[PDB]
Short mmCIF file of C-alpha atoms and ligand atoms in Angstrom, two decimals:
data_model
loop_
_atom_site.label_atom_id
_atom_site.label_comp_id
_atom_site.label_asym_id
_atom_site.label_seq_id
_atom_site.Cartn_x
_atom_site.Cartn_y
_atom_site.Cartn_z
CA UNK A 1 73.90 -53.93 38.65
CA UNK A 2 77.16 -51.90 37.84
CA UNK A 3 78.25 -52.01 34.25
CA UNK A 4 82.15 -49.47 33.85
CA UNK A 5 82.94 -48.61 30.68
CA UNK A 6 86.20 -46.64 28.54
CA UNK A 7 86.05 -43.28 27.55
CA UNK A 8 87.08 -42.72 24.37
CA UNK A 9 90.74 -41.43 24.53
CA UNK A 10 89.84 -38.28 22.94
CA UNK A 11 87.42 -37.39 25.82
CA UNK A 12 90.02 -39.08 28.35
CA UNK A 13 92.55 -36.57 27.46
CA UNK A 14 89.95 -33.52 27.46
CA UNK A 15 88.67 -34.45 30.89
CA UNK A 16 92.23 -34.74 31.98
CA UNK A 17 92.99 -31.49 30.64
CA UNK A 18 89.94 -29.92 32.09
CA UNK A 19 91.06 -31.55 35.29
CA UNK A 20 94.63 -30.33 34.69
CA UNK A 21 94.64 -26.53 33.22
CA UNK A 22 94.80 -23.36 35.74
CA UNK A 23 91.95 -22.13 34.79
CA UNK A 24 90.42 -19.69 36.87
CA UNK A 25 86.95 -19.14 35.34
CA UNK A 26 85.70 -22.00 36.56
CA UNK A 27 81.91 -20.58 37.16
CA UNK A 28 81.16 -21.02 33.37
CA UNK A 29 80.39 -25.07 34.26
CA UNK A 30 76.81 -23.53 35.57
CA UNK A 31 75.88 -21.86 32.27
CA UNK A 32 77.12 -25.02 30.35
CA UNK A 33 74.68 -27.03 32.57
CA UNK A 34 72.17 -24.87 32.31
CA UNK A 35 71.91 -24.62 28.63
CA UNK A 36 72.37 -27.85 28.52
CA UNK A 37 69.05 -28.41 30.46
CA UNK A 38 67.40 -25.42 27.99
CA UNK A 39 67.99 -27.52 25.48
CA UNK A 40 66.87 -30.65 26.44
CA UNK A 41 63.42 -29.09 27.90
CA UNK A 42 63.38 -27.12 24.33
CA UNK A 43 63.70 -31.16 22.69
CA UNK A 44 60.74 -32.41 24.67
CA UNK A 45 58.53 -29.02 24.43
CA UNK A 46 58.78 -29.88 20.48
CA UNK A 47 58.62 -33.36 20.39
CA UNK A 48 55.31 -33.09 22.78
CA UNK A 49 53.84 -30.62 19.99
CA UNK A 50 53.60 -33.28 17.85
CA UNK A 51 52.78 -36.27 20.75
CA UNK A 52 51.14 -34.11 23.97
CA UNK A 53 51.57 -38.10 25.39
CA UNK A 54 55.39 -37.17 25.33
CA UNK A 55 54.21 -35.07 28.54
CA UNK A 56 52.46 -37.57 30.60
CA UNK A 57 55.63 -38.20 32.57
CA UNK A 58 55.68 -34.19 33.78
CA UNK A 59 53.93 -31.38 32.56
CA UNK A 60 56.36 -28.49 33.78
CA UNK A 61 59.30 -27.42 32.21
CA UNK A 62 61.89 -25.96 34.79
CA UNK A 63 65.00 -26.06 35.94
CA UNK A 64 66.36 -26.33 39.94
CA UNK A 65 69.44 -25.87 41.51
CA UNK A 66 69.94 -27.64 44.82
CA UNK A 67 73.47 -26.93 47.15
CA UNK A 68 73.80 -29.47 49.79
CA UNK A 69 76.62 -28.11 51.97
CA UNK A 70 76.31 -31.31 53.99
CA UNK A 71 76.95 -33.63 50.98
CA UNK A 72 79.15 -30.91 49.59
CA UNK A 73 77.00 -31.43 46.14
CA UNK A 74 75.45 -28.41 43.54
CA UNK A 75 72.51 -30.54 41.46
CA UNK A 76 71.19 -29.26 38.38
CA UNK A 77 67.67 -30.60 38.08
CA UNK A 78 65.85 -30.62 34.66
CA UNK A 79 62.29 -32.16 33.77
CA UNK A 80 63.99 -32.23 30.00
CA UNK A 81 63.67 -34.52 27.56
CA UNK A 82 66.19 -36.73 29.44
CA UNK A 83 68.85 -39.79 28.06
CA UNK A 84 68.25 -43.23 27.07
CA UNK A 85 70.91 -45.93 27.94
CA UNK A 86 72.20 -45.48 24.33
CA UNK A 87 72.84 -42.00 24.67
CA UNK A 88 74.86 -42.26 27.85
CA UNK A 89 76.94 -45.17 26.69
CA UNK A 90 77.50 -44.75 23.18
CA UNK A 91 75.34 -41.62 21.38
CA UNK A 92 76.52 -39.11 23.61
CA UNK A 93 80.17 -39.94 23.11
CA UNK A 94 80.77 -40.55 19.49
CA UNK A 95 79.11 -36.60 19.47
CA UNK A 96 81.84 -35.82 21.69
CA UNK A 97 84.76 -37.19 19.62
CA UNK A 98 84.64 -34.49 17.28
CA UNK A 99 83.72 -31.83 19.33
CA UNK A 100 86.40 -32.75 21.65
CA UNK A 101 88.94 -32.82 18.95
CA UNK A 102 87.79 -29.00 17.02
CA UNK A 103 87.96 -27.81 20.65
CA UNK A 104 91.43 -28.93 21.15
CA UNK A 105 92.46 -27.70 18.35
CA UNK A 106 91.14 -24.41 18.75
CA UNK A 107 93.00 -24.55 22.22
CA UNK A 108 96.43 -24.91 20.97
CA UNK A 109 94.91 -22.08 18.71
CA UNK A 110 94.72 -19.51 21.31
CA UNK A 111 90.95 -20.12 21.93
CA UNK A 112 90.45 -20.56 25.83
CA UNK A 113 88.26 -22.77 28.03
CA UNK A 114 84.80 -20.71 28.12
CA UNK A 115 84.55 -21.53 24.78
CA UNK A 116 83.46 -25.26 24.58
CA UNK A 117 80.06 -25.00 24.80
CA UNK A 118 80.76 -24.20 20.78
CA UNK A 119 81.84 -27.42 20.35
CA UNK A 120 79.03 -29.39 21.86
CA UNK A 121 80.96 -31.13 24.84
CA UNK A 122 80.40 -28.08 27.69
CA UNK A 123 78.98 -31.08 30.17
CA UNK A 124 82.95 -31.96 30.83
CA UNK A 125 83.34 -28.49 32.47
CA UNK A 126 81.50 -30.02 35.31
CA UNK A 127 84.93 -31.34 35.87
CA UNK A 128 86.62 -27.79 36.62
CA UNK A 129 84.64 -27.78 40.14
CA UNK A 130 83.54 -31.50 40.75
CA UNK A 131 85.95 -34.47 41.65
CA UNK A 132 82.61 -36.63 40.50
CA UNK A 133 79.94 -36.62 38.51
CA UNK A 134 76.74 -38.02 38.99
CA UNK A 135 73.86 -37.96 36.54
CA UNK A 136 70.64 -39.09 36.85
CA UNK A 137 68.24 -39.38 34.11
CA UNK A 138 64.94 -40.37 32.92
CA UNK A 139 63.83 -40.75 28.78
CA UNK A 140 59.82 -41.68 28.15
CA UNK A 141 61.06 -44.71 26.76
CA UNK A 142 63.40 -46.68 28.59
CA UNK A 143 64.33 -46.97 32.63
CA UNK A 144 65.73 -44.28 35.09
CA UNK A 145 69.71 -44.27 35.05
CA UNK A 146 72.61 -43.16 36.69
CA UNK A 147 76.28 -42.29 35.25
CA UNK A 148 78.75 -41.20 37.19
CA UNK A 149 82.81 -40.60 36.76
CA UNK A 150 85.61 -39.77 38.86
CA UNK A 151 87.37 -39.58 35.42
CA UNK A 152 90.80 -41.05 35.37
CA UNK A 153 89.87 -42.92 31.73
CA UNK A 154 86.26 -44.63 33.24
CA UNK A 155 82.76 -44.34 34.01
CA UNK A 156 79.82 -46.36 35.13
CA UNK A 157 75.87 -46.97 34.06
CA UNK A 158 73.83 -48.65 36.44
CA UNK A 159 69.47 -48.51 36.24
CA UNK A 160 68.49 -46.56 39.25
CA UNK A 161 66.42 -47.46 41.98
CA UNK A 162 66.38 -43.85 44.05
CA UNK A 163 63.44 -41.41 43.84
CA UNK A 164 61.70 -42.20 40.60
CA UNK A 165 61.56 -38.51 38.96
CA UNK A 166 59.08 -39.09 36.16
CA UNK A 167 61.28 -37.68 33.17
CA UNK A 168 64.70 -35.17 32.91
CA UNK A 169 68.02 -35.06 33.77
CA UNK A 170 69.75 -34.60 37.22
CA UNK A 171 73.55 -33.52 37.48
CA UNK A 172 75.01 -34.04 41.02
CA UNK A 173 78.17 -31.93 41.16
CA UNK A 174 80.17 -33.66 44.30
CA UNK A 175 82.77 -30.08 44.88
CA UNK A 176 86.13 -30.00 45.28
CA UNK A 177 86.99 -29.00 48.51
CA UNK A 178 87.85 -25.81 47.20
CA UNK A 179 84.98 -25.30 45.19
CA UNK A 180 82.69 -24.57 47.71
CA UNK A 181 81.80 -21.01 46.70
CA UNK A 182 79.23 -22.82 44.60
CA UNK A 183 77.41 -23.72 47.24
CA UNK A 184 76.29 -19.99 48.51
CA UNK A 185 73.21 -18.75 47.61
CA UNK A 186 75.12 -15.21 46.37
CA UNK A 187 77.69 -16.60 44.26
CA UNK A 188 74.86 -19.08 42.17
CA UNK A 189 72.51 -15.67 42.33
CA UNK A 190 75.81 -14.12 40.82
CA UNK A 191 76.32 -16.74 38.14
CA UNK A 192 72.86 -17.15 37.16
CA UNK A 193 72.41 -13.44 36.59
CA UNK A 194 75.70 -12.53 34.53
CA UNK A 195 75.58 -15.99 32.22
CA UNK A 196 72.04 -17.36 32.16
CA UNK A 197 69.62 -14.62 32.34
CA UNK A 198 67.74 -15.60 29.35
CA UNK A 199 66.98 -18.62 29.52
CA UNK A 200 63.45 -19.49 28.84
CA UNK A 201 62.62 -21.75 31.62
CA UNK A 202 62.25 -21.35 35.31
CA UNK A 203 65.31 -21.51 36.85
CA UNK A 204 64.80 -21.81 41.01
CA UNK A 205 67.39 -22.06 43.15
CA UNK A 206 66.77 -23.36 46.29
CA UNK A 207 67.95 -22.73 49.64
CA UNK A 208 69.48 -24.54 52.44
CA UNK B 13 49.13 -25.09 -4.95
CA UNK B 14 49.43 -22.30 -2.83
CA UNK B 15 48.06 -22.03 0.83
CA UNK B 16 48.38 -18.63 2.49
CA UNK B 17 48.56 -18.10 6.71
CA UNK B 18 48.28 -15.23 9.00
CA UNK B 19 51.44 -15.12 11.39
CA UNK B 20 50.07 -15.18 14.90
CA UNK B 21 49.71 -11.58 15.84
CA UNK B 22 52.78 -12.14 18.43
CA UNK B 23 55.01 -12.95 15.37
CA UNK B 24 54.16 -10.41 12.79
CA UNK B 25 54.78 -7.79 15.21
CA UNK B 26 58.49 -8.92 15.79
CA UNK B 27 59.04 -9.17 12.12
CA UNK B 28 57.60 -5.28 11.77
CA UNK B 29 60.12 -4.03 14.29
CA UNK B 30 63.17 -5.80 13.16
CA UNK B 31 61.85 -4.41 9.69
CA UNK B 32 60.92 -0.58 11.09
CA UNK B 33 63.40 -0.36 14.24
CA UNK B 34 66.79 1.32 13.27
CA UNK B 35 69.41 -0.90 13.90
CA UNK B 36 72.96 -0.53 11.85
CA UNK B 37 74.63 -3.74 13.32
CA UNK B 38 72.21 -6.11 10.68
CA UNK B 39 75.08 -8.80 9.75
CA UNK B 40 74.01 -10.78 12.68
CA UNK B 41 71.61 -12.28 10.29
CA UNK B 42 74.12 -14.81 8.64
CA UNK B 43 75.23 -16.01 12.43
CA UNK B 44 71.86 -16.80 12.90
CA UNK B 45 70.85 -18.56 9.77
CA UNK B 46 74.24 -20.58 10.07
CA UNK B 47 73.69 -21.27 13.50
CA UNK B 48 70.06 -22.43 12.80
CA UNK B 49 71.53 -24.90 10.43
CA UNK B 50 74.22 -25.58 12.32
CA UNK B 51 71.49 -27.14 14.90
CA UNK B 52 69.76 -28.88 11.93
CA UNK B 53 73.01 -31.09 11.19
CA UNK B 54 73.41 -31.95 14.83
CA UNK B 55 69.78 -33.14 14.83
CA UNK B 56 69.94 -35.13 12.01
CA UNK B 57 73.30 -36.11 12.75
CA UNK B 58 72.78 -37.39 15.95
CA UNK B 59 69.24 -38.78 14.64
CA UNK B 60 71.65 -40.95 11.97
CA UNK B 61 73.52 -43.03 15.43
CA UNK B 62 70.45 -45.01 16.41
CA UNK B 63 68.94 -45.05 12.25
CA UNK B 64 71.57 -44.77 10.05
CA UNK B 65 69.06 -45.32 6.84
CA UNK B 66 68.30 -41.80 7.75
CA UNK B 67 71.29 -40.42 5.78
CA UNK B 68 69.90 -42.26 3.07
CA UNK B 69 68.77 -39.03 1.61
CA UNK B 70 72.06 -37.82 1.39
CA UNK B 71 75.29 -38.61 3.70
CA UNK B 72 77.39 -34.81 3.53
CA UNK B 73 76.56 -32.33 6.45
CA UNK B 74 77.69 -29.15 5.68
CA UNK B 75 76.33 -26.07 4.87
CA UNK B 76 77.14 -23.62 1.54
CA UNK B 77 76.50 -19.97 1.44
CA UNK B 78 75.32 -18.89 -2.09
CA UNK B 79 75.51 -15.58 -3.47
CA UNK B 80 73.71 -14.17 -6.82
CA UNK B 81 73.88 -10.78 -7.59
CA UNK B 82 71.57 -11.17 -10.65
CA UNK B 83 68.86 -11.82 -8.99
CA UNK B 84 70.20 -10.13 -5.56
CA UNK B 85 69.98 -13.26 -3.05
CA UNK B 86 72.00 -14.79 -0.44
CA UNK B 87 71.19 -18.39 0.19
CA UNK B 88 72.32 -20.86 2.91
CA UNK B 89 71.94 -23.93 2.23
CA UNK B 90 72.37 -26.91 4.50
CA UNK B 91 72.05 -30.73 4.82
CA UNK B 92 70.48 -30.71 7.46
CA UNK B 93 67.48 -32.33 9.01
CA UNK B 94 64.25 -29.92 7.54
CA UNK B 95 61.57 -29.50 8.54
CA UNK B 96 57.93 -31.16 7.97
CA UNK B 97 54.79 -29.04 6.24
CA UNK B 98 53.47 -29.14 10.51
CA UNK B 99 57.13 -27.70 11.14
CA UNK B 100 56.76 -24.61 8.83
CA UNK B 101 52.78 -24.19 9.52
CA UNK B 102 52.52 -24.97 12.76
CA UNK B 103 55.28 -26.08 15.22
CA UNK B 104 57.37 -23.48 15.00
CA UNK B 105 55.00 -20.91 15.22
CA UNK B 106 53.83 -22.55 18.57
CA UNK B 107 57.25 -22.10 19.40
CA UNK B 108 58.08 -18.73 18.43
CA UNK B 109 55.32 -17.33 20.62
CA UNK B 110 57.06 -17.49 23.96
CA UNK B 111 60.46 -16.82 22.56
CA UNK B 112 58.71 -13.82 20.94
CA UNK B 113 57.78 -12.30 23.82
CA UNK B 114 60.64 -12.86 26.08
CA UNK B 115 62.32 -11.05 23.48
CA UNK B 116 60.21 -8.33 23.26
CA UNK B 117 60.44 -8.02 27.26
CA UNK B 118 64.12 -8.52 26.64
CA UNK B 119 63.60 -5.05 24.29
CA UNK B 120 61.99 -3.08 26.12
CA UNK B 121 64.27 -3.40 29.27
CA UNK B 122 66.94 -2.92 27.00
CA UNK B 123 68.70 -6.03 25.14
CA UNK B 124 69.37 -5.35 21.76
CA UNK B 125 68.67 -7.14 18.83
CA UNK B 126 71.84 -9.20 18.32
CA UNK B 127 70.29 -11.09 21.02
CA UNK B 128 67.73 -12.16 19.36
CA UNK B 129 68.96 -15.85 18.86
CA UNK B 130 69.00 -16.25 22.89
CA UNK B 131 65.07 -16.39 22.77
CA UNK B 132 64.85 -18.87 19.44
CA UNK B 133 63.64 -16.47 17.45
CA UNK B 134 66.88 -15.82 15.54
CA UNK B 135 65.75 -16.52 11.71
CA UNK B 136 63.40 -13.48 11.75
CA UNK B 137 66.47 -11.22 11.82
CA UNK B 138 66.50 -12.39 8.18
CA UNK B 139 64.38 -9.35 7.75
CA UNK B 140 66.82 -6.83 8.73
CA UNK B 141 68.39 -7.66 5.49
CA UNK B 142 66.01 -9.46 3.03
CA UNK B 143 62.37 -7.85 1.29
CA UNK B 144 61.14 -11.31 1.29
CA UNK B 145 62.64 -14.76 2.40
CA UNK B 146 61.81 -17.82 0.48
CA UNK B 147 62.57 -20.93 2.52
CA UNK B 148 62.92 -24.81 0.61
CA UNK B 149 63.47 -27.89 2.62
CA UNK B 150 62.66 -31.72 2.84
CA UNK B 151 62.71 -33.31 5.68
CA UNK B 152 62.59 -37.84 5.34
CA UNK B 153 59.13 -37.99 6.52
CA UNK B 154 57.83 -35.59 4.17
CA UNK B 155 57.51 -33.66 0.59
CA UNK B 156 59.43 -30.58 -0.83
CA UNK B 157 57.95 -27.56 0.61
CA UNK B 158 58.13 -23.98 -0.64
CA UNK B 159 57.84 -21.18 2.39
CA UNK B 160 57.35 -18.09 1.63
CA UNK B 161 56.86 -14.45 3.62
CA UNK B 162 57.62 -10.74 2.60
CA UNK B 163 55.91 -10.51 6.14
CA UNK B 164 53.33 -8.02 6.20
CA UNK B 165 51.45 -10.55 8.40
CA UNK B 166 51.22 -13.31 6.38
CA UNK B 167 53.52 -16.18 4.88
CA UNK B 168 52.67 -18.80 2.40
CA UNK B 169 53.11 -22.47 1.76
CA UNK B 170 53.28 -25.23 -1.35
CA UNK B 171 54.65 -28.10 -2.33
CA UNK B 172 58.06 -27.37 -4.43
CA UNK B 173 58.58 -28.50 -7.50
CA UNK B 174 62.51 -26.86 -8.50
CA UNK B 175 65.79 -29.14 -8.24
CA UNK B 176 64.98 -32.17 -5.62
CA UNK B 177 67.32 -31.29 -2.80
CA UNK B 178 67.51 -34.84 -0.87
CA UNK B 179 67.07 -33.66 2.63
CA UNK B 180 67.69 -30.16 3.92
CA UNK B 181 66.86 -26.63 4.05
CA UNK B 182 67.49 -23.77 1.94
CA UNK B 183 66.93 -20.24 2.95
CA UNK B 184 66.87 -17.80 0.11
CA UNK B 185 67.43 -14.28 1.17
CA UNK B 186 65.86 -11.36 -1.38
CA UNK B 187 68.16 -8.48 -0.54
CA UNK B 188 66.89 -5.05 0.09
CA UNK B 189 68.02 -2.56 -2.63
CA UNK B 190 70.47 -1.18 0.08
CA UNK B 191 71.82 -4.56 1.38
CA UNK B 192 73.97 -5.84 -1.00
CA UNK B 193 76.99 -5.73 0.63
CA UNK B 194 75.97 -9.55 2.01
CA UNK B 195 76.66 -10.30 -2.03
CA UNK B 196 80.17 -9.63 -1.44
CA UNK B 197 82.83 -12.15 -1.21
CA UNK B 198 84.86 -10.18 1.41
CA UNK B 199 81.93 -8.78 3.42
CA UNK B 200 80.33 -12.60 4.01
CA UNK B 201 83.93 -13.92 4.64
CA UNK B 202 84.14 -11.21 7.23
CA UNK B 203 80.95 -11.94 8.83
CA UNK B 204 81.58 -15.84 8.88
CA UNK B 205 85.29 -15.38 10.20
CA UNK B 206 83.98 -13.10 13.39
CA UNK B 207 81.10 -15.11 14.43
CA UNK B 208 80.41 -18.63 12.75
CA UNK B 209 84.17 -19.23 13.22
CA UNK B 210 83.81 -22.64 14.99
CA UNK B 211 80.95 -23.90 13.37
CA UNK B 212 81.78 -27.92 13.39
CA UNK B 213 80.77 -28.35 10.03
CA UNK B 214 82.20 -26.80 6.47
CA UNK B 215 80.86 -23.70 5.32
CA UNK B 216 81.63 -23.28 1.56
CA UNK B 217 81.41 -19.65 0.04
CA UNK B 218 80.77 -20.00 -3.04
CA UNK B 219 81.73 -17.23 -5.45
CA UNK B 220 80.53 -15.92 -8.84
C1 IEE C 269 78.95 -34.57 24.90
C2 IEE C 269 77.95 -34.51 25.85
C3 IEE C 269 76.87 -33.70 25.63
C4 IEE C 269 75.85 -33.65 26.59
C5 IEE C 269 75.88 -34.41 27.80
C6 IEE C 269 74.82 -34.33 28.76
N1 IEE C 269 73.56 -33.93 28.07
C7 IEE C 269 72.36 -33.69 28.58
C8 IEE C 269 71.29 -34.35 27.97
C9 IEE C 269 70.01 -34.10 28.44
CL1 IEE C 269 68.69 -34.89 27.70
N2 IEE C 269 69.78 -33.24 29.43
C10 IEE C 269 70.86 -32.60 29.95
N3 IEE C 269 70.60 -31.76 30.91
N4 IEE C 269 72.15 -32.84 29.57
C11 IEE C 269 76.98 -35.24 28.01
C12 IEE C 269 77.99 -35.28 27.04
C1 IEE C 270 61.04 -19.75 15.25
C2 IEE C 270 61.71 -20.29 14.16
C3 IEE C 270 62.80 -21.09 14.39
C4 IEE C 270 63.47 -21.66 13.29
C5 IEE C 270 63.07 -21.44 11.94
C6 IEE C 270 63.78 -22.03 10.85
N1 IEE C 270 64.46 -23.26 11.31
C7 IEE C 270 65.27 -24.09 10.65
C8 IEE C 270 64.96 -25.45 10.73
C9 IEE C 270 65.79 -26.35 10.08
CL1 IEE C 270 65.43 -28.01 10.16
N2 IEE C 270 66.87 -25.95 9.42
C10 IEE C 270 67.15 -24.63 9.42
N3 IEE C 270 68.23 -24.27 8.77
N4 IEE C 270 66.34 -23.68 9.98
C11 IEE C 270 61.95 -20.64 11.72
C12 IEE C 270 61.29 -20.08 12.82
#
C-alpha cells in the first residue's frame, strides 16, 4: 500500500529551513494554500472550456476551510483540478528544484520568507505551522491519493481508500502545538480578509 | 484573411475605463505582460515533464523585451506555451467575464487599478499605455495567429504570415504619442528591477 520516497536535497534543506528559521509571520502559509487552490480551480475551469466532460467529477468550484480542534488539523479543501501520481512523485518536485534554489538565493539576498510564493514552491510554508502534512487529491484521470510528510528528508504516496471526493485537492494541516491560533474562527476570518480577499472562488470557512 | 469580433460588452467596457479613467501609476503594464508570460513558460514547462517532444518547437524559456522607437513599440516576447485560435476567440474571453466584473466591483469599492492582475484580467492594462496592441503566438496544436484590437469594442483575428516564431507569444505594444518613456532603456530597466525582479526565467532588454 505505502510507497516512501527522497526529497530532493534541495527541497530537504528548504523544508528544514522553513522548519528551522524564527520566523514570525507564519499566517502567510493560508494565502499560499489558498492561491494555490485558485489556481488549480482556474486549471480545470479552462481545461473544462474546451472538454465540459472535464466537469463530470464536480461542477462547483470552491474552496473550504475546516479546523478540527479535536484532531488539532486546519484542511484546505479544493474541487481543483487536482494531482496525478506523477505530479506528486516526480512533476511537482523537479518544479520545485529551481524554485527552491532562486528562493534561497534571494534569501541570503535579503529577501524574506513571505516571498516564496514568487518562486513557485509556497506549499512548503505549510511547514511553518504543521509538524505534518497530509494531502489528499483527486485528477479525472487516475485514482484518489494521499501524500503526507513529517519532513526530516521523506515522504509517502499511498492510493486512498477514505471518502471518495470526486475531483480536487485536500491539505490537512496537523498544528503544532503552538499553532493553534489557526484553529479560531477570528484569526482564519483575520487571515482570509487581509491576504486573500480576491480570490475568485468561494472561500467558506466552516465552523466547529 | 481577416475575421473581426465584438468584445463581449463586459470586456470592452474595462478596456474603455483603463483607456478614459485617469490613472498616473500606468507602468504596471510591463509587470503584467511579464507576469502573463511568466505563467506561459511554467505551463509549457511543466507540460514538457510528462511530453518532452513538446519543446520540440523550440527548447529556451525566456522572455525578451523589445523596444523600437521607429515605429514606437514595446514588445515582449516569450517562449512560452501560446495560445490556440479558440484561446484568442473564445476561451479567454469566457474567462475574462467573471474576472471582469470582480474587478469592476473591486473599483467601485475602491481597489485601484494596479490590482488588476488579482482578477486575471491583467493584459488589458496594456491599454493604459498602447493605441492598439497587436498580439502573435503559436501554440503546438495550432497555426500562427495575428490578434489584433485598438479596442473600441472590437478585436480582430488571422492567420500570420511574418517570421515563424516556433512556439510562443508576442505582444506588440503601439505606444501612445505620450508614452514613450516605456522606449527607454533606463525607464524599462526600472520597471523590471521593482516588480518582475524574481521572475524565474531571463528577461533580456534588448537595446537599440
Ligand atoms: C512545488 C509544489 C507546488 C505545488 C504543490 C501543491 N500543489 C497543488 C496542486 C493542485 Cl492541483 N491543487 C493544489 N491545491 N495544490 C506542491 C509542491
Ligand atoms: C483575459 C486574458 C488573459 C490573458 C491574455 C493573454 N494571455 C497570454 C497567454 C499566453 Cl499563452 N502567453 C501570454 N504571454 N499571454 C489575454 C486575455
Amino acid at each position: 500500500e505505502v510507497e516512501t520516497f527522497a526529497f530532493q536535497a534541495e527541497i530537504a534543506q528548504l523544508m528544514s529551513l522553513i522548519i528551522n528559521t524564527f520566523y514570525s509571520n507564519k499566517e502567510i502559509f493560508l494565502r499560499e494554500l489558498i492561491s494555490n487552490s485558485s489556481d488549480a480551480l482556474d486549471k480545470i475551469r479552462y481545461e473544462s472550456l474546451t472538454d465540459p466532460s472535464k466537469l463530470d467529477s464536480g461542477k462547483e468550484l470552491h474552496i473550504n476551510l475546516i479546523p478540527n480542534k479535536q484532531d488539532r488539523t486546519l484542511t484546505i479543501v479544493d474541487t481543483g483540478i487536482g494531482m496525478t501520481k506523477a505530479d506528486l512523485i516526480n512533476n511537482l518536485g523537479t518544479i520545485a528544484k529551481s524554485g527552491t534554489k532562486a528562493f534561497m538565493e534571494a534569501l541570503q539576498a535579503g529577501a524574506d520568507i513571505s516571498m516564496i510564493g514568487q518562486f513557485g514552491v509556497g506549499f512548503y510554508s505549510a511547514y511553518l505551522v504543521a509538524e505534518k502534512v497530509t494531502v489528499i487529491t483527486k485528477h479525472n484521470d487516475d485514482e484518489q491519493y494521499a501524500w503526507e510528510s513529517s519532513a526530516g528528508g521523506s515522504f509517502t504516496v499511498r492510493t486512498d481508500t477514505g471518502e471518495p471526493m470526486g475531483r480536487g485537492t485536500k491539505v490537512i494541516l496537523h498544528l503544532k502545538e503552538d499553532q493553534t491560533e489557526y484553529l479560531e474562527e477570528r484569526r482564519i476570518k483575520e487571515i482570509v480578509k487581509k491576504h486573500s480577499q480576491f480570490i475568485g472562488y468561494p472561500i467558506t470557512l466552516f465552523v466547529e
